[PDB]
Amino acid sequence: KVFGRCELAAAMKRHGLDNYRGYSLGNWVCAAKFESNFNTQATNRNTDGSTDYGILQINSRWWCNDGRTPGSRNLCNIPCSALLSSDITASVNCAKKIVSDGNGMNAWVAWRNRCKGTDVQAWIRGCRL
């Protein structure tokens, strides 16, 4: 599923991301835009053989099982395919674990390079939340 901006913002808010660990909703929407272009089915292979999955491009090296990332962990205890669902629950729940792990949203390289320090509220402007 490819979400619209406000549609995803609303879904993220319902799933508890608004100000989760101090990150306002615009941060999460901005991250999703640059990570996946709001597409729940997005996958991208990393140089190390791991793969990033879903709206927040969650990495198989640490967070989910895809059966083809040798020596990896599955810290969210989920198959990576669950991260591609039209239902974002699995992605949100796993993102909460990631963002709580010490480095905050710096886990998402696109967030660090493209969202951090920017007017992230613009991503939710005009949305009936």
**Per rule CB under 5 A, is residue 43 in the interface with Na ion?**
yes
Residue of 35, 66, 87, 119 with catalytic role: 35
For residue 50, CA distances in Å to 12, 21, 30, 62 come to: 26, 27, 23, 9
| Known active-site residue 7 | no
Please state the closest distance from residue 9 (CB atom) to Na ion, in A.
15
Location of structure tokens 């974002």: 88
48 among the known binding-site residues? no
How far is Cα 119 from Cα 107, in angstroms, rounded to an integer? 20
| 48 given a catalytic annotation | no
C-alpha–C-alpha distance, residues 88 and 75, integer Å: 18
Least Å distance, CB 1 to Cl ion, is: 20
Interacting residues toward Na ion by CB under 5 A: 2, 22, 40-43, 51, 54-56, 58, 60, 65-66, 68-69, 72, 74, 83, 91
